[PDB]
Design a protein around this motif. Structure first.
Motif, PDB file in Angstrom:
ATOM      1  N   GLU B 167       0.885  -1.151   0.000  1.00 41.29           N
ATOM      2  CA  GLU B 167       0.000   0.000   0.000  1.00 41.29           C
ATOM      3  C   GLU B 167       0.929   1.208   0.000  1.00 41.29           C
ATOM      4  O   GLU B 167       0.498   2.363  -0.029  1.00 41.29           O
ATOM      5  CB  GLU B 167      -0.922   0.017   1.221  1.00 41.29           C
ATOM      6  N   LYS B 168       2.204   0.885   0.094  1.00 42.68           N
ATOM      7  CA  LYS B 168       3.227   1.911  -0.052  1.00 42.68           C
ATOM      8  C   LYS B 168       3.327   2.384  -1.499  1.00 42.68           C
ATOM      9  O   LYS B 168       3.389   3.513  -1.835  1.00 42.68           O
ATOM     10  CB  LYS B 168       4.585   1.375   0.412  1.00 42.68           C
ATOM     11  N   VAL B 169       3.161   1.328  -2.342  1.00 41.84           N
ATOM     12  CA  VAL B 169       3.157   1.539  -3.785  1.00 41.84           C
ATOM     13  C   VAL B 169       1.859   2.197  -4.244  1.00 41.84           C
ATOM     14  O   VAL B 169       1.854   3.029  -5.148  1.00 41.84           O
ATOM     15  CB  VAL B 169       3.304   0.208  -4.549  1.00 41.84           C
ATOM     16  N   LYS B 170       0.759   1.801  -3.620  1.00 41.88           N
ATOM     17  CA  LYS B 170      -0.556   2.331  -3.954  1.00 41.88           C
ATOM     18  C   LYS B 170      -0.627   3.826  -3.664  1.00 41.88           C
ATOM     19  O   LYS B 170      -1.113   4.598  -4.490  1.00 41.88           O
ATOM     20  CB  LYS B 170      -1.618   1.584  -3.158  1.00 41.88           C
ATOM     21  N   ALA B 171      -0.155   4.239  -2.492  1.00 46.33           N
ATOM     22  CA  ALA B 171      -0.154   5.658  -2.167  1.00 46.33           C
ATOM     23  C   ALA B 171       0.804   6.310  -3.152  1.00 46.33           C
ATOM     24  O   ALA B 171       0.668   7.489  -3.478  1.00 46.33           O
ATOM     25  CB  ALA B 171       0.335   5.881  -0.743  1.00 46.33           C
ATOM     26  N   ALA B 172       1.770   5.521  -3.618  1.00 42.36           N
ATOM     27  CA  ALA B 172       2.770   5.989  -4.561  1.00 42.36           C
ATOM     28  C   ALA B 172       2.146   6.268  -5.924  1.00 42.36           C
ATOM     29  O   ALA B 172       2.295   7.392  -6.436  1.00 42.36           O
ATOM     30  CB  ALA B 172       3.894   4.960  -4.698  1.00 42.36           C
ATOM     31  N   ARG B 173       1.441   5.283  -6.516  1.00 45.34           N
ATOM     32  CA  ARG B 173       0.886   5.564  -7.845  1.00 45.34           C
ATOM     33  C   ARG B 173      -0.157   6.624  -7.791  1.00 45.34           C
ATOM     34  O   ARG B 173      -0.301   7.407  -8.737  1.00 45.34           O
ATOM     35  CB  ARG B 173       0.394   4.327  -8.695  1.00 45.34           C
ATOM     36  N   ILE B 174      -0.813   6.717  -6.649  1.00 49.62           N
ATOM     37  CA  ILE B 174      -1.844   7.700  -6.500  1.00 49.62           C
ATOM     38  C   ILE B 174      -1.282   9.085  -6.226  1.00 49.62           C
ATOM     39  O   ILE B 174      -1.869  10.075  -6.651  1.00 49.62           O
ATOM     40  CB  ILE B 174      -2.828   7.284  -5.403  1.00 49.62           C
ATOM     41  N   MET B 175      -0.150   9.165  -5.529  1.00 45.43           N
ATOM     42  CA  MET B 175       0.451  10.463  -5.243  1.00 45.43           C
ATOM     43  C   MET B 175       1.084  10.969  -6.536  1.00 45.43           C
ATOM     44  O   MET B 175       1.091  12.173  -6.819  1.00 45.43           O
ATOM     45  CB  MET B 175       1.523  10.339  -4.156  1.00 45.43           C
ATOM     46  N   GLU B 176       1.610  10.034  -7.322  1.00 46.60           N
ATOM     47  CA  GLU B 176       2.245  10.367  -8.589  1.00 46.60           C
ATOM     48  C   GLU B 176       1.242  11.073  -9.490  1.00 46.60           C
ATOM     49  O   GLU B 176       1.587  12.009 -10.215  1.00 46.60           O
ATOM     50  CB  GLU B 176       2.744   9.093  -9.278  1.00 46.60           C
ATOM     51  N   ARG B 177      -0.002  10.614  -9.442  1.00 40.78           N
ATOM     52  CA  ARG B 177      -1.053  11.203 -10.257  1.00 40.78           C
ATOM     53  C   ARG B 177      -1.345  12.641  -9.814  1.00 40.78           C
ATOM     54  O   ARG B 177      -1.359  13.553 -10.638  1.00 40.78           O
ATOM     55  CB  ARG B 177      -2.325  10.347 -10.183  1.00 40.78           C
ATOM     56  N   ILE B 178      -1.574  12.841  -8.518  1.00 41.99           N
ATOM     57  CA  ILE B 178      -1.850  14.174  -7.998  1.00 41.99           C
ATOM     58  C   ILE B 178      -0.747  15.139  -8.431  1.00 41.99           C
ATOM     59  O   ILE B 178      -1.024  16.236  -8.924  1.00 41.99           O
ATOM     60  CB  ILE B 178      -1.931  14.172  -6.459  1.00 41.99           C
ATOM     61  N   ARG B 179       0.504  14.726  -8.246  1.00 40.00           N
ATOM     62  CA  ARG B 179       1.649  15.548  -8.629  1.00 40.00           C
ATOM     63  C   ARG B 179       1.622  15.873 -10.123  1.00 40.00           C
ATOM     64  O   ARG B 179       1.826  17.024 -10.521  1.00 40.00           O
ATOM     65  CB  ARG B 179       2.954  14.831  -8.263  1.00 40.00           C
ATOM     66  N   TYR B 180       1.364  14.865 -10.950  1.00 38.27           N
ATOM     67  CA  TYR B 180       1.313  15.075 -12.394  1.00 38.27           C
ATOM     68  C   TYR B 180       0.201  16.056 -12.748  1.00 38.27           C
ATOM     69  O   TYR B 180       0.282  16.773 -13.750  1.00 38.27           O
ATOM     70  CB  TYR B 180       1.084  13.736 -13.108  1.00 38.27           C
ATOM     71  N   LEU B 181      -0.827  16.102 -11.906  1.00 35.59           N
ATOM     72  CA  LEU B 181      -1.965  16.978 -12.152  1.00 35.59           C
ATOM     73  C   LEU B 181      -1.926  18.348 -11.487  1.00 35.59           C
ATOM     74  O   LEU B 181      -2.504  19.289 -12.007  1.00 35.59           O
ATOM     75  CB  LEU B 181      -3.259  16.269 -11.742  1.00 35.59           C
ATOM     76  N   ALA B 182      -1.264  18.470 -10.343  1.00 37.03           N
ATOM     77  CA  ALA B 182      -1.231  19.754  -9.648  1.00 37.03           C
ATOM     78  C   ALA B 182       0.140  20.160  -9.125  1.00 37.03           C
ATOM     79  O   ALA B 182       0.938  19.325  -8.700  1.00 37.03           O
ATOM     80  CB  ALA B 182      -2.256  19.754  -8.482  1.00 37.03           C
ATOM     81  N   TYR B 183       0.401  21.461  -9.171  1.00 36.67           N
ATOM     82  CA  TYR B 183       1.653  22.036  -8.681  1.00 36.67           C
ATOM     83  C   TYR B 183       1.330  22.509  -7.260  1.00 36.67           C
ATOM     84  O   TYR B 183       0.398  23.284  -7.064  1.00 36.67           O
ATOM     85  CB  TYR B 183       2.059  23.219  -9.572  1.00 36.67           C
ATOM     86  N   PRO B 184       2.092  22.047  -6.250  1.00 31.57           N
ATOM     87  CA  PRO B 184       1.841  22.439  -4.855  1.00 31.57           C
ATOM     88  C   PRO B 184       2.332  23.811  -4.409  1.00 31.57           C
ATOM     89  O   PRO B 184       3.505  24.149  -4.568  1.00 31.57           O
ATOM     90  CB  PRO B 184       2.493  21.313  -4.068  1.00 31.57           C
ATOM     91  N   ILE B 185       1.416  24.580  -3.824  1.00 28.19           N
ATOM     92  CA  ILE B 185       1.681  25.932  -3.338  1.00 28.19           C
ATOM     93  C   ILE B 185       1.290  26.074  -1.859  1.00 28.19           C
ATOM     94  O   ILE B 185       0.105  26.067  -1.518  1.00 28.19           O
ATOM     95  CB  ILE B 185       0.896  26.967  -4.188  1.00 28.19           C
ATOM     96  N   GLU B 186       2.294  26.216  -0.993  1.00 31.96           N
ATOM     97  CA  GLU B 186       2.085  26.349   0.453  1.00 31.96           C
ATOM     98  C   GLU B 186       1.477  27.687   0.839  1.00 31.96           C
ATOM     99  O   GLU B 186       1.859  28.724   0.300  1.00 31.96           O
ATOM    100  CB  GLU B 186       3.414  26.176   1.197  1.00 31.96           C
ATOM    101  N   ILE B 187       0.545  27.670   1.786  1.00 29.04           N
ATOM    102  CA  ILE B 187      -0.095  28.910   2.210  1.00 29.04           C
ATOM    103  C   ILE B 187      -0.009  29.179   3.707  1.00 29.04           C
ATOM    104  O   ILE B 187      -0.080  28.261   4.527  1.00 29.04           O
ATOM    105  CB  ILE B 187      -1.542  28.950   1.732  1.00 29.04           C
ATOM    106  N   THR B 188       0.106  30.458   4.055  1.00 27.26           N
ATOM    107  CA  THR B 188       0.310  30.839   5.444  1.00 27.26           C
ATOM    108  C   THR B 188      -0.132  32.245   5.867  1.00 27.26           C
ATOM    109  O   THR B 188       0.523  32.796   6.782  1.00 27.26           O
ATOM    110  CB  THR B 188       1.800  30.677   5.759  1.00 27.26           C
TER     111      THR B 188
END
Ligand SMILES: Nc1ncnc2c1ncn2[C@@H]1O[C@H](COP(=O)(O)OP(=O)(O)O)[C@@H](O)[C@H]1O
Ligand SMILES: [Mg+2]
Lengths: 188, 188
Positions: B167-188
């Motif tokens: 499920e390490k890999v599962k969170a992996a393929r799924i996180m890979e997708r989010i990353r491929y789809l969105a650029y992360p921007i931290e807010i504060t």
């Protein structure tokens, strides 16, 4: 029909397989030359014949993938099986994976192969993608492609170093397919 | 003005009354969000293949509001958007694939032009993540449909969050997708 039943597919929605080489309009050169080539291919096809496939490139949404599905439907109408692979997803399932090698085998061996969307995101791809291409050359297995990039750009694109071999793979491709640019409106 | 185009799911529509002007670029994380947003709206076109925003930060900042804002600037130019309160859908999903229509709801969200998933994390499950969620991301990747997110966690923390190896890999393929789809921007 049950045409779709003969058309295999990996990583891509089967609803896009609802296609026909008659729904494609004459509107411009890209397609006129493309389906003309496509239909001659589908008419003359016979197991084990040097035969060039198509390498369709062009902007997003012009109907490149639909062209492949269309061709596959024509062939399934000849009772010949083909396989369409969303390639970007093929290279990914390969990094995160039970079974997959039995399938690369199927890919290298299918009668007609259609690699969709080549070119988006050295490299291990020197072991996986090249061999496939090389096996289809050696065995006269027709091969098609669809990319957003043309021959010139695709090379410049896959994994840049500080080699030549990327250019060596580019050679199998133009040996395997005759490139055609698809222009037209943005169908979306 | 532009509210009949942008709709929601599982969250009282009175929250989507937003604007990119109703905000004040207080501290930088925010500055690049609004910039990303205007870039996005100006260069948007169906089938384009463009990142979305993955906004992460602690409770009570403006992640949700920002999405609504981007969703509003997008309406100012025609484009219809869709923001969905994620935790609700997953909760709802638990028992509802039972004989019926809500899944035609899942179908629509998968195919919308712009999808915005509000606050991922904050609960939930695995056949849902990897069978309900995953396929959504995989489809919108293949079709190049813009997707946005908001989460109390940064990408690295949303992964180790979802794990509950293989499920390490599962969170992996799924996180890979989010990353491929969105650029992360931290807010504060
Ligand atoms: N010749 C055509 N006739 C009818 N529909 C078409 C045709 N070509 C493409 N489409 C439609 O356009 C969409 C796909 O364009 P697409 O195949 O993704 O171009 P790429 O293949 O992106 O250049 C499909 O959803 C399909 O319904
Ligand atoms: Mg395509």
């Amino acid at each position: 029909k049950r045409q779709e039943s003969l058309i295999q597919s990996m990583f891509m929605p089967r609803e896009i397989l609802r296609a026909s080489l008659s729904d494609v309009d004459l509107n411009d050169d890209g397609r006129i030359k493309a389906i003309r080539f496509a239909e001659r291919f589908v008419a003359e096809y016979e197991p084990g014949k040097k035969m060039k496939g198509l390498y369709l490139h062009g902007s997003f949404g012009v109907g490149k993938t639909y062209l492949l599905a269309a061709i596959a439907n024509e062939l399934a109408k000849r009772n010949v099986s083909s396989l369409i692979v969303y390639v970007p997803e093929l290279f990914r399932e390969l990094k995160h994976s039970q079974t997959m090698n039995e399938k690369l085998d199927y890919i290298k061996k299918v009668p007609v192969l259609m690699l969709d969307d080549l070119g988006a995101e050295s490299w291990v791809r020197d072991d996986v993608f090249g061999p496939i291409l090389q096996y289809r050359m050696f065995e006269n297995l027709p091969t098609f492609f669809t990319s957003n990039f043309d021959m010139q750009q695709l090379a410049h694109h896959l994994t840049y170093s500080q080699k030549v071999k990327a250019a060596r793979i580019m050679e199998r491709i133009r040996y395997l397919a005759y490139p055609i640019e698809i222009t037209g409106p943005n169908r979306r």
